[PDB]
Amino acid sequence: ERDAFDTLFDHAPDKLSVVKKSLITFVNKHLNKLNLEVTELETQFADGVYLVLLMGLLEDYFVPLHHFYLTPESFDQKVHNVSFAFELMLDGGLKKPKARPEDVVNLDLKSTLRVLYNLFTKYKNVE
């Protein structure tokens, strides 16, 4: 199903930097609590590591480090991390992201932004 991010990547790429920067601040607002920082949304979320930890942060807890792969050895360990974060998104009562977990690992920015914006809409007010 087509949405606003499809409009952004096809017809308005000039607005992309504005999307990137605001989602960077939202993501850093929580990840800075763990002494972590995100400068590039594409490459820094492909691990799943930050995505998993962010999910805990948005629900106000440290995720046990053995629940996922802190240093993923392969593509399939990275895919597991992402889908594990997706399951945490379901636990938080959020609607399932319309993105394949493989795309996040494969550095699909459109998919990553969609996932991150889903978190934004729900966790807007969370300090």
């Binding site: 949405d3 952004l8 504005v18 999307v19 605001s22 989602l23 914006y117």
Partner: peptide, 12 residues
């Protein structure tokens, strides 16, 4: 218009 609201949402 749908993209305009998205950008405004992120800018608030």
């Amino acid at each position: 218009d749908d993209l305009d609201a998205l950008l405004a949402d992120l800018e608030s």
